[PDB]
A paper describes a structure:
The IL-17 family of cytokines and receptors have central roles in host defence against infection and development of inflammatory diseases. The IL-17 family of cystine-knot cytokines consists of six members: IL-17A–F, which exhibit differential binding specificities to five receptors, IL-17RA–E. The most well-studied IL-17 cytokines, IL-17A and IL-17F, are produced by T helper 17 (TH17) cells and are elevated in the context of inflammation. IL-17E (also known as IL-25) is a key regulator of type 2 immune responses and driver of inflammatory diseases, such as allergic asthma, and requires both IL-17 receptor A (IL-17RA) and IL-17RB to elicit functional responses. Thus, IL-17RA serves as an organizing hub mediating IL-17 family signalling at the membrane by acting either as a direct receptor for IL-17 ligands or as a co-receptor.
We conducted cryo-EM studies of IL-17A–IL-17RA and IL-17A–IL-17RA–IL-17RC complexes. We co-expressed and co-purified complexes containing IL-17A, IL-17RA and IL-17RC. These molecules co-eluted in a monodisperse peak over gel filtration with IL-17A–IL-17RA having an apparent 1:1 stoichiometry, with IL-17RC being sub-stoichiometric on SDS–PAGE. We also determined a 3D reconstruction for a minor population of classes containing the IL-17A–IL-17RA dimers with a single IL-17RC bound to IL-17A to a resolution of 3.01 Å; this structure contains a single copy of the complete IL-17RA–IL-17A–IL-17RC heterodimer. The tip-to-tip interface present in the IL-17A–IL-17RA and IL-17A–IL-17RA–IL-17RC structures superimposes with the IL-17RB–IL-17RA tip-to-tip interface in the IL-25–IL-17RB–IL-17RA ternary complex and the IL-17RB–IL-17RB tip-to-tip interface in the higher-order IL-25–IL-17RB complex, revealing a large conserved spacing between the IL-17RA–IL-17RA and IL-17RA–IL-17RB membrane-proximal domains, which has likely implications for the assembly of intracellular ACT1 molecules that can support downstream signalling. The tip-to-tip receptor architecture was present in our cryo-EM structures of an IL-17RA–IL-17RA dimer and another IL-17RA–IL-17RA tip-to-tip dimer with IL-17RC bound to one copy of IL-17A. The tip-to-tip interfaces of these IL-17A-containing structures are superimposable onto our arrayed IL-25–IL-17RB and IL-25–IL-17RB–IL-17RA ternary structures.
Numbering used by the authors:
A (entry chain F): 33 to 210, 216 to 234, 247 to 268, 281 to 298
B (entry chain E): 42 to 95, 109 to 129, 132 to 149
C (entry chain G): 22 to 56, 59 to 74, 80 to 95, 119 to 146, 148 to 166, 169 to 193, 195 to 240, 246 to 268, ...
D (entry chain D): 37 to 51, 64 to 154
E (entry chain A): 34 to 52, 61 to 127, 130 to 154
F (entry chain C): 33 to 213, 217 to 271, 277 to 304
G (entry chain B): 42 to 152
């Protein structure tokens, strides 16, 4: 997990003074529970987003959309911690929403968004908004959680994203099988590519002088190695 | 160590190599493992996504961690261990 | 004027000002309170057309009763099953004001109606008793057809039979999802939901029958058009399609989708084939109707017996009722019997060439063997069909003489 | 010992043949460290970059990939203090599984 | 007599947005009802057409009233404005007038 | 739709000054809302309850069990209005809970009760609990609704309520016929309402009403309330005989105890 | 009229038939109607359970849908009150609506 950019992370909307700070999904209100727990947020939904780093890279980003409720618990809302948890491996990253001024006005439906969570391709991230203070022991959960699935590099817009490009989403195999002879393409990496058929052959690492220069092997699938992959990504054939 | 001071300003020692991405193998594995959420609101981590996978000796990859629990007010923190499952790998019987 | 647009307004007397405040307002009389105040005098109505819908137009005569200007308000009530409504009308006569005489009248443009409708009139406050006007709307004026589609936009189904096949074409629009049903005259025949326009194939024998077409909308108006009364070929086919059925030995029934007056008489069929001899006289043309059970006076049946059916003073049906059960036909001759006063009995013979009495010296086939036929009849060998105090009839076997 | 550092709390402490029998064998690595609890962590790094069949030969068709999770360790702070600890998040490579690659072509 | 809203938690002021078929089912229905002029000189609507189901059974196609299947009125609570104190003032009511008459198959218990 | 009694309906529970109030089913919050609003009820359920009276009446009643929410909006909660809305009608009875004490803690789970709503057999309602005050326009629902189905007299428990006793559910008029040139005998009930025998003949299972006959048995005198009465019917195999009581609870719609004729 | 003063202290004149004199014939009727939920937190009543028919006709004794007649919805002119938005001189308003209070089956106007 990672934040997009450590810039001026604001979530404030007019009439409120959000200041965003780091967290670890262990609020002080969980160490020191307070009796008055504000209600859950309403209508949580997550949408994809792509933001531009100053270095010009393309990182998929979770855009979280959730809104409060009209009940009286809004006076006891002091923040809404946002939690992004990877499923298969349990890396958790949380960011603390902190509302300096009390949300004592229901004149307009408050809607909050947060889109600086670099979401990797193909990795789901349960996004939870735990309102602060957190519930007292054996109380109402007051937290919203929803799975946020993200498609692989086969997605049209995702195949141009930096994590997907660095994996070889734009590499053209252009295999040619014709004694038998095969030929395959190259991308500018000092990695040893593979051709598997009942036979096995090895190809050394291409020097920086043959970035896309074709090569061939005499007597059919292709698997590259990379920095974004030591053993597993798109296997061409 | 009955009484030991523990600081809860948790630091992240997982500043790994950012280019090293991750994949979800719950469908591509020889022994695919399904995902189930474990929620105790008196616990960190409150949600642990254990594994319940469907010579097919697909034994659950089971390792135990440390959990900072919560004790009833009559006693309130109780560090324990729960032997949870990570994934599922196939082994020879 | 008779035609007004799809809106409500007022037709106002000249001199006085006039306005409307209709919002289906809360309409209640209250109580009469005492006090030169304007007041209604009579209710005048004219059936007027609103476009397109029929709606009664009402008018309120005005005057001054009681003991630098003049202002008043007239409330117009309404009632009709199941609608209640109220309407505000303000009349302001400039100080054209006189005591004890009429001043003018105001008119409300439109009041939706179907049927009886009643109207009232209150000033606010109610200075005098409310006026009264009942009215019974007609169900047929010359402008009714075109004005309202409910009477003119009857769904259309025109039929063609040029190719001898009854082809019905639907003149309805393309997006219509209407209903179709067929009955008899009521036993329904068939029904179908289908999209128009569409061609439905019928048959000449099928068209006896009636058709109903209607849109598939709530409170559908269904047209049951039966224009085949004038067609004579339809009745001719019905008579041809009509069949005679012999229920038992001494009973028969006439079956047909429709019932028409007719007459039935017995008949005799020779074993030779197509030639057939009617049995009237001495029998009489008995009245017969469809779905009416008639019992023959005969006590015994014979395969050669037949029934002739007269419809509209003309023979149309002739079937061998006993052939379906007592067949095949037998070469048996028929002898007519008659009885009179003084216990006298007379016998006659029926032949294809004519009728001859027995005994006789004629050269006819029956006359030659008349004595043998009489001896067989008196010995009980022959079979008797019907008996009566004044006559009878017998069937005599013939194979003993030729075969 | 609660003080003006509220997040410092006091807690009470409470307290296998697959590696030689799996189609994706792993070799455990000892992360011995006396400063943190536990002092020994066992990390499974894949013996082969591919999987082994019933024969046991490495096949490039089937891939071995390190299934990991983020677990917790308590490291002494200040160092070598038996009555103080620091709650830490580290990543441990728990085991190696067998997965099929995403293969596509013309 | 009242003019404004004061010292009364439930005395409110009302305005004007009160807002030619379906008038032959009184006979065309299988369970006809005769409208009764329940006219009150202080109640809006001034006339309510209560449904008094004219025949206890339902008339089939032949026109002969059949006793195999019965008819029950559909009443409904409505709000009406009866004047009080007897200006323009009103007070609500919950009166159970009858609107229509739907005819139902009887409940049959065998043996 | 009524209350079972007009006695003290106090909802008192430890630490609560609540008093059940009579109300028309419009609130003062509807007329004059306030900005700050409590939350909706939780775990609201309705069960079939029977409650006696001081005169031996047995009424089916609606037991309403709802739990307050844990969130800190309870500090502005001034009560809940109930409702039992009829299905085929639009009749509403709505009683009010004027919580005199100001709830300020959530030390225990509150289970709230109200069991004084009389219901009817073979009838369906809609019960809703709506905390007070009402929300601002275009606000959150602030209430919970449920559908209450009350079973019919065929239920072994409903059959003995005064609803199902006034409608003759317990009635056991075992009607029989005898082959005559027929006679139908049935036993009357404790009511002064006329009885309506309906007789039709079905020659075959082709569903043809070959012959139909109607006879009227008058309102029985007190000496024959529970006696059996036999009436012969003129006949013109399946001669269905149906008997219908005109009990004041069922003007013309009661359980009509039918009969059939065996061919032999 | 335009401005009237309505005291919302509803006087219930449905004080009758406290015993059971009703049933549910939405299903047994030959012109069944499926009830519909009308929800409006700005109006009194906030909930009205109107109806909608199930077919375009009655049902014959065989239990199959019959097209010989027309199932039509009985409708009434119930007065309902509605809460005006703040940009209105009057805070409350009376509106009549047409709601399906039932659904009977009727003879067609023309055969
Ligand atoms: C069945 O009907 C017969 C009709 O004859 C009843 O017999 C007579 O009933 C009347 C009263 O209706 C008595 O006054 C007579 O004494 C009865 N007997 C005779 C011979 O007339 C008979 O009671 C009816 N069955 C039952 C069980 O009441
Ligand atoms: C937010 O900060 C501004 C800074 O000028 C202050 O004026 C305001 O009162 C604060 N609270 C709000 C906007 O709720
Ligand atoms: C939050 O953590 C990130 C990554 O460790 C760091 O770059 C950033 O400065 C931190 N922000 C604060 C307010 O501590
Ligand atoms: C209608 O009003 C007039 C006014 O005098 C009255 O005479 C008449 O009886 C009224 N009609 C009915 C049917 O009440
Ligand atoms: C049917 O259509 C034909 C073709 O236009 C027309 O001649 C005929 O008169 C129509 N039938 C009737 C009954 O009008
Ligand atoms: C009432 O309906 C019957 C049955 O169709 C009909 O004969 C009669 O003419 C109708 N009467 C009126 C006034 O509509
Ligand atoms: C409930 O009422 C009693 C009666 O006076 C009172 O003493 C008590 O304080 C009330 N409950 C609360 C919580 O105030
Ligand atoms: C309370 O309401 C019931 C009906 O809901 C009624 O019978 C009773 O008389 C009322 N009591 C008072 C004091 O208004
Ligand atoms: C009903 O059952 C009772 C039970 O014994 C019997 O005495 C009575 O004759 C029966 N009635 C009939 C068959 O009509
Ligand atoms: C008639 O008898 C039944 C029991 O057989 C009883 O419940 C009922 O109250 C009686 N009727 C009267 C009016 O007492």
């Amino acid at each position: 997990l990672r934040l997009l950019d450590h810039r001026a992370l604001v979530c404030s909307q007019p009439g409120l003074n959000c200041t965003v700070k780091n967290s670890t999904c262990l609020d002080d209100s969980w160490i020191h529970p307070r009796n008055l727990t504000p209600s859950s947020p309403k209508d949580l939904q997550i949408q994809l987003h792509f933001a531009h780093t100053q270095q010009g890279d393309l990182f998929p980003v979770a855009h979280i959309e959730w809104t409060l409720q009209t009940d009286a618990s809004i006076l006891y809302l002091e923040g809404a911690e946002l939690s992004v948890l990877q499923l298969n491996t349990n890396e958790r990253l949380c960011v603390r929403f902190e509302f300096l001024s009390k949300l004592r006005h229901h004149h307009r439906r408050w809607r909050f968004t947060f889109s600086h969570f670099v979401v990797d391709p193909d990795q789901e991230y349960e996004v939870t908004v735990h309102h602060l203070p957190k519930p007292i022991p054996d109380g109402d959960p007051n937290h919203q959680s929803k799975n946020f699935l993200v498609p692989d590099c086969e997605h049209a817009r995702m195949k141009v994203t930096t994590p997907c490009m660095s994996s070889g989403s734009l590499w053209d195999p252009n295999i040619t099988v014709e004694q038998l002879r095969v030929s395959f393409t190259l991308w500018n990496e000092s990695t040893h590519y593979q051709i598997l058929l009942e036979h096995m052959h090895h190809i050394p690492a291409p020097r920086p002088e043959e970035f896309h220069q074709r090569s061939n092997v005499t007597l059919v699938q292709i698997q590259p190695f990379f920095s974004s992959c030591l053993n597993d990504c798109l296997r061409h054939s | 160590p009955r009484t030991v001071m523990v600081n809860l300003n948790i630091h992240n020692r997982n500043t790994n190599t950012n280019p090293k991405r991750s994949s979800d193998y719950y469908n591509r594995s020889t022994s695919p493992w399904n995902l189930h959420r474990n929620e105790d609101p008196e616990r960190y981590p409150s949600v642990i996504w254990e594994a319940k996978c469907r010579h097919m000796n697909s034994v659950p990859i089971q390792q135990e961690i440390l959990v900072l629990r919560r004790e009833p007010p009559h006693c309130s923190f109780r560090l324990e261990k729960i032997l949870v499952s990570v994934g599922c790998t196939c082994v020879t019987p | 004027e008779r035609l007004v647009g799809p809106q409500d307004a007022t037709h106002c007397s000249p001199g006085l000002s006039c306005r409307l405040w209709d919002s289906d307002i809360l309409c209640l009389p209250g109580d009469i309170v005492p006090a030169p105040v304007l007041a209604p005098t009579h209710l005048q109505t004219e059936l007027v057309l609103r476009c397109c819908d029929l709606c009664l137009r009402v008018a309120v005569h005005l005057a001054v009763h009681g003991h630098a200007s003049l202002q008043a308000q007239v409330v117009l009530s309404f009632q009709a099953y199941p609608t209640a409504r109220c309407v505000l009308l303000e009349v302001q006569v400039p100080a054209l004001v006189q005591f004890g005489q009429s001043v003018g009248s105001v008119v409300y443009d439109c009041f939706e109606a179907a049927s009886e409708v009643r109207i009232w009139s209150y000033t606010q406050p109610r200075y005098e008793k409310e006026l009264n006007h009942t009215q019974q709307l007609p169900d047929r004026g010359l402008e009714v057809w075109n004005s309202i589609p409910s009477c003119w936009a009857l769904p259309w189904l025109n039929v063609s039979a040029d190719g001898d096949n009854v082809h019905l074409v639907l003149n309805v629009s393309e997006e219509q999802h209407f209903g179709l049903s067929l009955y008899w005259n009521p036993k329904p025949r068939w029904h179908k939901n289908l999209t128009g326009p569409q061609i439905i194939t019928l048959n000449h024998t099928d068209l006896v029958l009636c058709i109903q077409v209607w849109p598939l909308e709530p409170d559908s108006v269904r047209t049951n058009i039966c224009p085949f009364r004038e067609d004579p070929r339809a009745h001719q086919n019905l008579w041809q399609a009509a069949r005679l059925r012999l229920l038992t030995l001494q009973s028969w029934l006439l079956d047909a989708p429709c019932s028409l007056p007719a007459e039935a008489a017995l008949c005799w069929r020779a074993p030779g084939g197509d030639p057939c001899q009617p049995l009237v006289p001495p029998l009489s043309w008995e009245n017969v109707t469809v779905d009416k059970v008639l019992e023959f006076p005969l006590l015994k049946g014979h395969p050669n017996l037949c029934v002739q059916v007269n419809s509209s003073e003309k023979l149309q049906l002739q079937e061998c009722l006993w052939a379906d059960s007592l067949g095949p036909l037998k070469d048996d001759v028929l002898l007519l019997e008659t009885r009179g006063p003084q216990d006298n009995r007379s016998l006659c013979a029926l032949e294809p060439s004519g009728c001859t009495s027995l005994p006789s010296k004629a050269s006819t086939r029956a006359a030659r063997l008349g004595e043998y036929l009489l001896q067989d009849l008196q010995s009980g060998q022959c079979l008797q069909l019907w008996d009566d105090d004044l006559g009878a009839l017998w069937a005599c076997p013939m194979d003993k003489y030729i075969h």
